[PDB]
Each structure stands twice: as C-alpha cells, then as structure tokens.
Ligand binder design. Structure first.
Ligand SMILES: C[C@H](CCC(=O)NCc1ccc(OCCN2CCOCC2)cc1)[C@H]1CC[C@H]2[C@@H]3CC=C4C[C@@H](OS(=O)(=O)O)CC[C@]4(C)[C@H]3CC[C@]12C
Length: 225
C-alpha cells in the first residue's frame, strides 16, 4: 500500500463511521444533565423481564443495523464473499455496539443515554444478568479514560469487525489482508496525531467477547443481516 492508499482508507472508514452514528456526539454531550428522575428509574424497574427485553432488543436491533451499514460502507468489506460478510457481522456487530456505547456514556455519573435521557445501570434491573450489565458499564468507563476522538473510534471499530480469526471464515487470507490494511491505517492515524499510547491501553479481544450475551446472539436480526 502507498501513502495515498492508506490515507484514502483512513478517510473512507472515518466517513462511514460519521454517516452511521444514530446520535451526534455534540447532542449526547449537551444532554448529560438530562437524567431520568427516581420516578422514571422506578418505572423501568417496574417493567417485566419480557417488557424490558422487548424494548432493549428493539434498540439493539437498530444499533446492529447501523453497524451493518458501517460495514457496507467500509472500503473492502463488500468485496469479501457473502459467507464471510455474515460471519464477521455475526461475531462482531454487538462488540462494535459496546464500543460505540462510550459515546453515549457519561463517566462523571456512570450513566448511558437510553430512550432520550441518561440513566445508570439500575435502569436495566428488570433484565436480570446484573453482573453482566455492571461489566458492560465498567467497560465503557475504562474506554472513557482514553478520551477517544471519533476518527479513533471509527478506526478501532473497523478492526473489531474485520477480524481474520473468526471461526467459520472461508477466505481467511483475504480477510487477513483487509485487517492488515486497517491495522496500517489505524497505526498511521495514531502516529500522525501522536496518540500511539492508546494501543497498549485498548481492551483485549477476549474482553469484548465476554460482554456479548447469548440472548443478543439469538436475536432474529442475525438471521436477517
Ligand atoms: C447495556 C444494555 C443491555 C445489553 C445487554 O446485552 N444486556 C445483557 C442482557 C440481560 C438480559 C437479557 O434478557 C433476558 C430476558 N430473556 C431473554 C430470552 O427470552 C426471554 C427473556 C438480554 C441481555 C444495552 C441495551 C440498549 C443498548 C443501546 C442501544 C442503542 C445505542 C445507540 C448507539 O448510538 S450510535 O450513535 O453510536 O449509533 C450507542 C450505543 C447505545 C446507547 C446502546 C448501548 C447499550 C444498551 C444500553
């Protein structure tokens, strides 16, 4: 790859990310003081497990659909075979959503933007799996310490998705090549902006995977990508 190719790849990834965010960062930041009242937190906790899962499942489906659009606009992804596109999305879409969450996360009070306001992990009590939700909130907290720019999140999430070690891939070296060009792009961007230090601070692949619920993987969205 040339300097021109790598610079064009950086631009493509960052443009795709920009066009596939549901919410604008500036709006998310302005809304930080808009926190659910105790009455509203109560209302969420009052819902049945099913009622809460129906709401959350829909929001996650939408989030996943934005990740799919992100992938489609990523230079090189649509050139991979259909099997591999699907394998990568199945294994990585939720991981991308969990990274994207830090944009909607407020480290100051440990809240996430959800249905129009900020709320803590106690909003999600009716779902059960309290340890997992805590672990998810802890994960966003750790990511928040890095102070990612949007271009950084864009390049990092591209690499979360384009992982040549996902079991079930049928063009392994082709995915390896795209992954490598994305590695070049990410490392390039970080060197030029003097941000190489974040490489050592990024959570490992295994960490992201452990945060993905079985219940998410069973959502019908994964049969209709
Ligand atoms: C953390 C939360 C829970 C996830 C989870 O997995 N919890 C474990 C669990 C527990 C029980 C369960 O259910 C059992 C009940 N059973 C199941 C079997 O059937 C019977 C009932 C299922 C799962 C999720 C839910 C919604 C997620 C938001 C959805 C959308 C966005 C927008 C996006 O903006 S953008 O600009 O970037 O695009 C940024 C991200 C953000 C903020 C998301 C952030 C994350 C959130 C809060």
């Amino acid at each position: 790859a040339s300097l021109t190719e790598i610079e064009h790849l950086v631009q493509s990834v960052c443009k795709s990310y920009r066009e596939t965010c549901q919410l604008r960062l500036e709006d998310l930041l302005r809304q930080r003081s808009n926190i659910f009242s105790r009455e509203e937190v109560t209302g969420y906790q009052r819902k049945s497990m099913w009622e809460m899962w129906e709401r959350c499942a829909h929001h996650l489906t939408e989030a996943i659909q934005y990740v799919v659009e992100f992938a489609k606009r990523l230079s090189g992804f649509m050139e991979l075979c259909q099997n591999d596109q699907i394998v990568l999305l199945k294994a990585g879409a939720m991981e991308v959503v969990l990274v994207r969450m830090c944009r909607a996360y407020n480290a100051d009070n440990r809240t996430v933007f959800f249905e129009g306001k900020y709320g803590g992990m106690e909003l999600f009590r009716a779902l059960g799996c309290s340890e997992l939700i805590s672990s998810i909130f802890d994960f966003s907290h750790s990511l928040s310490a890095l102070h990612f720019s949007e271009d950084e999140i864009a390049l990092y999430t591209a690499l979360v998705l384009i992982n040549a070690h996902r079991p079930g891939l049928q063009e392994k070296r082709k995915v390896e090549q795209l992954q490598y060009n994305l590695e070049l792009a990410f490392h390039h961007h970080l060197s030029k902006t003097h941000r190489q230090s974040i490489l050592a601070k990024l959570p490992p692949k295994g960490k992201l995977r452990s945060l993905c619920s079985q219940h998410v993987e069973r959502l019908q969205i994964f049969q209709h990508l």
